[PDB]
Amino acid sequence: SLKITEVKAHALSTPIPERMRVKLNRQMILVEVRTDEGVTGVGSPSGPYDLAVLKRAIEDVIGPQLIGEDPANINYLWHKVFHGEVSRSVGIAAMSGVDIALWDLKGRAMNQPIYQLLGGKFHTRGVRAYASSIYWDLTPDQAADELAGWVEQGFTAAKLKVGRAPRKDAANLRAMRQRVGADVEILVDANQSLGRHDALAMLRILDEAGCYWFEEPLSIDDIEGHRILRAQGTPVRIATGENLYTRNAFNDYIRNDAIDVLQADASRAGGITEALAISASAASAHLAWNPHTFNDIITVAANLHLVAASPHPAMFEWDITHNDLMTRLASYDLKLENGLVQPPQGPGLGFEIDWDFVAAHAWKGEPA
Amino acid sequence: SLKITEVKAHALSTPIPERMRVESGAGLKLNRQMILVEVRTDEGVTGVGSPSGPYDLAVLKRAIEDVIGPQLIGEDPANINYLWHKVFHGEVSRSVGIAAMSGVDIALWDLKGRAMNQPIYQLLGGKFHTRGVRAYASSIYWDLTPDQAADELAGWVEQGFTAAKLKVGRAPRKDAANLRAMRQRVGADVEILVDANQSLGRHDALAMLRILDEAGCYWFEEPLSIDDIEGHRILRAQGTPVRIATGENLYTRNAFNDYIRNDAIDVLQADASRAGGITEALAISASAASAHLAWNPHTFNDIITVAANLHLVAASPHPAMFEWDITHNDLMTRLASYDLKLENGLVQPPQGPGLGFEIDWDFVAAHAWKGEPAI
Ligand SMILES: O=C(O)CCC(=O)C(=O)O
Ligand SMILES: [Mg+2]
Ligand SMILES: [Mg+2]
């Protein structure tokens, strides 16, 4: 029986090189939960959110509610904190990072990867990944080149940011499909930038180009607009969720027949604990859960252990942008085999932290 | 035009003299705490706000000064609508983020009213409730005995209150006994409100509702977890004369819309200092009115949160049921030159510019936070 002695939040911030910027810094909080017997777990509450707000929430609001507690009771602790002080968002985010750390700690205590605790792999072969993402302000040829580039590197799917210039978005999509043919999935992300009627015009283009999904087509507040898009009955999936923070917001999408793909992120929506609940509610409704994963290798890994164990058709976000928090933080890297990735096979999240890298990038006050 | 030069968040803390344990969780209530937001301009016109509480003072100070602040420095403060959306859609989007915005928005409205030398309610179309706003005493603690509960209610009625709120849900047999004794002591003219603080499941709430109906209670506040909209609809669907109320812990129009869409609410209790400022409270109030429901805000933290809500209530066409925190609280009585004037069971908003009173800045300087938790 362990006891928690420390809850630490390490603020990290690395500037993005000039020629890469589409974006000032890749930031994260590396949560570290320590115990009296020396078993340690780590986590990440995603981002970008203010690092000092997160650090303060984790060490000084959540932390004291955990000191002295048996880390094994993750279910109890999640509910202790939720009905502790945070309730009376960045708070759910803060909770998520701690929750992941607790799951990592649990896997490490048992010497098992997280996915083994969750019933083992569903996707034994691996998980279909997509390249995230091809960004704004490209010509048709550049968009198609970058896509062909990802395919050549082994991806069978990629995402395109759209919504700033819909006529150009359409030109891009047509060049892309033409370049790669029908066997590559092309995903689209509008980041809430469209109203209902522009989204409907866009959906007709997506349908013609055979797009896999239309992500955040509208403001997250407009559930009815999402219902309208879904109601058009195209084979293009309506997707949202990276900016939703509760089951009792995802349920409102479900109840209203408003969504095809839930994108709840374990590092944002209440941890592995709540992501398990959100994933199951999606399954119950015969809808997909394909999480947003974009921040660092910890948020990616946390989501990947759940994805690998879930029966959902996989469409797994893999950040391909220049990001030291993806490639340098830990011993686990991208490895594609026939378009598929496999979760780390070590204990807990399944890899080791490069603590030299950690200390080298402590936050000094940088924004993003 | 003016330009914003500074956005400050004064963290304030005052010691609680009485020894009071928290409702549950072996700990004492140590300090009353607040952020006093201060927005300054190049021509020296200042506005103040409060993002309510209890929230972590460091979290709020950082969010106000270092996340919102930079987005406002240099901006014209007169364009509150533009700024609200510059902030909301620019940054604090991707809560305590909405809480931080709320305090800032209130300070912008205070700044505006002061710039124009007018109280906020005048900007909002002037008074609807010209004679005053009906207040209730908040709140009678639950664990009391029937005669102790009835005595507190008698006591508030004697002070001139026409309505009071009782905490319930922790021991429904006691709750039931308290209400029978209360309704006995004062009769039928006094409104009895009830607050369960989300402590009930659906079925116990349904049992409770029957007793509230019997005692002719005005509303049933936070009968259930704020995440159980369907449960609230079920309670409302029983068709009793008891209003289903919630909202002090909801922070967006969207959450309130969800309740409305689902026939789940009678009284929205969005707090201007929590739910997105006077700006968003205006929108939430109008939505209540459009659906023929009431908006009676939660107001409980300090005189600024109270005054911000009261300016809006006074200009609004809802039947008034205005929360007056009756506990010992220096942030209610010593922060500013304005106080409770109950006359015929009614309050009036402050008559000065903006929020309508002056801050006691000596009090502020003397009560600077130094790291202590509220609990
Ligand atoms: O803190 C208290 O006792 C009152 C909180 C509450 O539920 C209210 O003011 O409505
Ligand atoms: Mg996205
Ligand atoms: Mg209440």
CATH at B243: 3.20.20.120
CA distances from B244 to B48, B137, B232 (A): 33, 19, 7
Beta-carbon contacts of B119 under 8 Å, excluding residues fewer than 6 positions away, are B113, B311, B349, B350, B351, B352, B353, B354, B355, B356
Probe target for ligand 1 pocket from B55, B197, B274, B375, with the most ligand atoms within 8 Å of CB: B197
3-state secondary structure of A334: coil
Q: Which residues line ligand 1 (CB under 6 A)?
A: B 138-139, 195, 197, 248, 298, 300
Residues B129 and B91 both lie in one domain: no
Do B244 and B153 share a structural domain? yes
Going by DSSP bridges, is the β-strand pair A25-35/A261-262 parallel, antiparallel, or unpaired? unpaired
Compute the radius of gyration of chain B from its Cα atoms.
20
The 3-class secondary structure across A199-259, one letter per residue, is HHHHHHHHHHHCCCEEECCCCCCCHHHHHHHHHCCCCCEEEECCCCCCHHHHHHHHHCCCC
Whether the Cβ atoms of residue B54 and residue B31 lie closer than 8 Å to each other? no
Residue A38 φ then ψ, to 5°? 90, 15
8 A C-beta contact, residue B118 and residue B126: no
| Judgement on whether residues A120 and A21 belong to the same structural domain of the protein | no
Of the candidates B253, B275, B284, B270, the residue with the CA atom closest to the CA atom of residue B323: B270
Chain centroid offset of residue A166 CA: 26
The distance of Cα B19 from the centroid of its chain, to the nearest Å, equals 25
Residues of chain B neighbouring A63 (CB-CB closer than 8 A):
none
Q: Residue A86: closest CA among chain B residues belongs to which residue?
A: B55
Looking at this protein, which amino acid is placed at residue A80?
K
For residue A134, what are the β-bridge partners?
A: A160
Q: How many CB atoms lie within 10 A of CB B302?
A: 26
Given an 8 Å threshold on Cβ–Cβ distance, is A248 in contact with B254? Answer: no
CA of A252 relative to ligand 2 center, distance in Å: 19
Question: CA B116, CA B352: separation in Å to the nearest integer?
Answer: 11
Crossing angle for the helix pair A140-152 and A166-180, to the nearest 10 degrees: 40
Whether residue B135 is found in the same domain as residue B276: yes
Are residues B371 and B337 part of one domain?
A: no
* A81 and A143 fall within a common domain: no
| A62 and A146, same domain (yes or no) | no
Given CB atoms, is A337 within the 8 Å cutoff of chain B? no
The CA angle B260-B263-B266, to the nearest 5 degrees, is 75
d(CA B224, CA B113): 38
Q: Does the beta-carbon distance from B227 to A243 stay under 8 Å?
A: no
Answer whether B59 sits within 8 Å of A53, measured CB to CB.
yes
Residue A36 tokens read as 């009296």
CA distances from B304 to A322, B35, B307 (A): 47, 10, 5
Structure tokens at A273: 């604990």
Pairing outcome for strands B191-195 and B219-221: parallel
For residues B300 and B323, what is the distance between their CA atoms, to the nearest angstrom? 7
Report chain B residues whose CB lies below 8 A from the CB of A247. Answer: 227
Question: For residue B9, what are the β-bridge partners?
Answer: B37
Query: Can the peptide bond before residue A96 be classed as cis, meaning omega within 30 degrees of 0?
Result: no
CB atoms near residue A256 (< 10 Å) = 14
Strand pairing report for B219-221 and B243-246: parallel
| Kind plus residue range of the DSSP H or E element containing A131 | strand A127-134
The β-bridge partners of B344 are: none
Answer left, alpha or beta for residue A316, where phi above 0 means left and psi between -120 and 50 means alpha. beta
Alpha-carbon distance of A347 to A220, in angstroms, equals 36
The answer on A217 and A103 residing in a single domain is no
Q: Are B195 and B161 in contact (CB under 8 A)?
A: no
- Structure tokens belonging to residue A306: 């759940």
Strand partners, A192: none
Cβ-contact B66, B95 below 8 angstroms? no
Which residues have a beta carbon within 5 Å of ligand 2, which is an ion?
Answer: A 189, 242
- B375 burial class (0-12, 13-18, 19+ CB within 10 angstroms)? middle
Beta bridge partners of B325: B138
Give me A111's structure tokens: 């010497």
Spacing, Cα B58 to ligand 1 middle (Å): 23
Q: Are residues A86 and A163 in the same domain?
A: no
Judged by CB atoms closer than 8 Å, whether chains meet at A60 and B62 is answered as: no
Q: Does B258 touch chain A (CB under 8 A)?
A: yes
- Residue A48 sits at the chain B interface (C-beta within 8 Å): yes
Secondary structure string (H, E, C) spanning chain B: CCCEEEEEEEEEEEECCCCCECCCCCCECCEEEEEEEEEEECCCCCEEECCCCCCCHHHHHHHHHHHHHHHHCCCCCCCHHHHHHHHHHHCCCCCHHHHHHHHHHHHHHHHHHHHCCCEHHHHCCCCCCCCCEEEEEEEECCCCCHHHHHHHHHHHHHCCCCEEEEECCCCHHHHHHHHHHHHHHHCCCCEEEEECCCCCCHHHHHHHHHHHHHCCCCEEECCCCCCCHHHHHHHHHCCCCCEEEECCCCCCHHHHHHHHHCCCCCEECCCCCCCCHHHHHHHHHHHHHHCCCEECCCCCCCHHHHHHHHHHHHHCCCCCCEEEECCCCHHHHCCECCCCCCECCEECCCCCCECCCCECHHHHHHCECCCCCCC
| Alpha carbon of A37 to ligand 3 centroid (Å) | 43
- Most distant pair of Cα atoms in chain B: their distance: 61
Distance CA A27, CA A10 (A): 11
Structure tokens at A38: 């020396």
Q: Whole-angstrom Cα distance, residue B349 to residue B304?
A: 11
H helices of A128-195, in order, are 140-152, 166-180
Q: Report the residue among B298, B306, B328 best suited for mutation to probe ligand 1: largest number of ligand atoms under 8 A from its CB.
A: B298
Choose from B68, B73, B96, B301 for mutation: most chain A CBs within 10 A.
B96
Nearest ligand, CA B141: 1
Beta-ladder partners of B48: B38
Phi then psi for residue A160, to 5 deg, are -120, 130
Instruction: For residues B205 and B304, give the distance between their C-alpha atoms in angstroms, rounded to a whole number.
Output: 33
- Residues in chain B, overall count: 375
How near does any CA of chain B get to the CA of A94, in Å? 12
A320 CA to centre of own chain: 13
Give the other-Cβ count within 10 Å of B71's Cβ: 17
Comparing C-alpha atoms, which of B217, B214, B155, B223 is closest to residue B185? B155
- Contact (Cβ atoms closer than 8 angstroms) between residue B168 and residue B142: yes
Q: Which of A29, A56, A256 is the best mutation test for B, with the most CBs of B within 10 A?
A: A56
CB contact under 8 A, B94 and A221: no
Q: Which residues in chain B touch residue A60, judged by CB atoms under 8 angstroms apart?
A: 56, 58
Q: Are residues A185 and A327 in the same domain?
A: yes
Handedness of CA B94, B97, B98, B101 (dihedral sign): negative
Q: Say which of A56, A246, A248 has its CB closest to residue B58.
A: A56
| Pair A73, A42: CB distance under 8 Å | no
Q: Decide: helix, strand or coil at residue A63.
A: helix
Cα–Cα distances in angstroms (integers) from residue A143 to residues A169, A170, A224, B227, B338, in the given order: 10, 11, 32, 43, 63
* Nearest residue to B293 via CA among B363, B231, B244, B234: B244
- Residue B3 alpha carbon to ligand 2 centre in Å: 35
Q: Are A97 and A301 in contact (CB under 8 A)?
A: no
- Contact list in B for residue A53 (CB cut-off 8 A) is 59, 62-63, 67, 96
Query: Residue A181 belongs to what domain range?
Result: 112-354
Residue B323, strand partner residues: B136
* A70: helix, strand or coil: coil
Domain count, chain A: 2
Give me the resolution in angstroms, 1 decimal: 2.0
| Whether residue B296 is found in the same domain as residue B205 | yes
CA-to-CA separations, B102 to A122, B30, B87, B170, in angstroms, rounded:
46, 25, 11, 32
Mutate to test the interface with B, among A69, A90, A189, A268 (most CBs of B within 10 A): A90
Give the CA radius of gyration of chain A.
20
Nearest one of B302, B284, B290 to B55, comparing CA atoms: B302
Contact criterion met (CB below 8 Å) for A272 and A249? no
In ligand 1, the atom with minimum distance to the C-alpha of B221 is 10
d(C-alpha A162, C-alpha B39), whole Å: 38
Burial class of residue B26 (count of CB atoms within 10 Å of its CB; 0-12, 13-18, 19+):
exposed
Neighbouring C-alpha atoms within 13 Å toward the C-beta of B77: 32
Please check whether residues B139 and B204 belong to one and the same domain.
yes
Question: How many angstroms does the Cα of residue B259 sit away from the middle of ligand 1?
Answer: 21
Question: Distance between CA atoms of B322 and B297, rounded to whole angstroms?
Answer: 7
The CATH number given to whatever domain includes residue B90 is 3.30.390.10
The minimum CA-CA distance between B154 and chain A, rounded to whole Å, is 31
Report residue A149 as tokens. Answer: 């580039």
B364: closest CA among B333, B334, B325?
A: B334
Instruction: Give the full edge-to-edge strand order of the sheet including A41-43.
Output: A4-15, A25-35, A41-43
How far apart are alpha carbons B183 and B180 in whole angstroms? 5
Residue closest to A209 by CA, chosen among A237, A168, A163, A175: A175
Residue to probe by mutation, ligand 1, list B195, B199, B325, B375, most atoms within 8 Å of CB: B195
At A357, list the tokens.
């890298």
CA B23 to chain centre: 20
